[PDB]
């Protein structure tokens with residue numbers, strides 16, 4: 066099982082799209098490409114993907130089975146991704162959700178996400194949830210909008226700098 070603790074972030078460098086899937090070539094951060102190889106199953110934005118090819122710090126994943134309930138087909142070259150290598154999150158993304166709002170501040174970012182009933186209707190505060198590979202506790206909830214707090218230090222190792230109103234994220238429902 067995964068911790069939902071992002072070890073570092075990669076940058077999508079290449080994306081070859083074909084009729085069935087898309088081959089994403091992700092440039093990994095120093096130290097992470099040495100910990101994986103072909104057949105390695107890891108978490109990219111919290112989604113279980115299998116390394117299909119690797120050369121230096123360029124890691125490739127064929128993204129297909131996940132294309133329909135994930136955010137991958139909407140990412141482009143240059144985008145940052147959260148990365149986690151195995152040793153809680155299973156890596157099976159339930160679906161996609163949008164950032165309803167986001168309030169930055171000294172401490173960190175209070176991000177509001179509108180969770181559709183299609184993903185889960187039985188959410189309670191204090192529960193954990195995975196957003197793009199980051200496991201966080203639901204600090205607050207009102208109907209379908211949940212509130213999660215992001216520590217500012219995350220900007221150094223995660224993709225969170227891309228969160229804005231209406232930005233789509235991978236959601237994994239826990240427990």
Ligand SMILES: Cc1cc2nc3c(=O)[nH]c(=O)nc-3n(C[C@H](O)[C@H](O)[C@H](O)CO)c2cc1C
Nearest residue numbers: 112113114115127128129130131134156157158
């Ligand atoms: C071991 C394992 C490997 C997987 N590899 C891929 C993959 O290479 N490409 C993909 O699109 N989906 C893959 N999936 C499915 C995806 O990670 C995710 O769980 C769901 O597709 C989200 O709807 C994999 C799932 C597991 C359990």
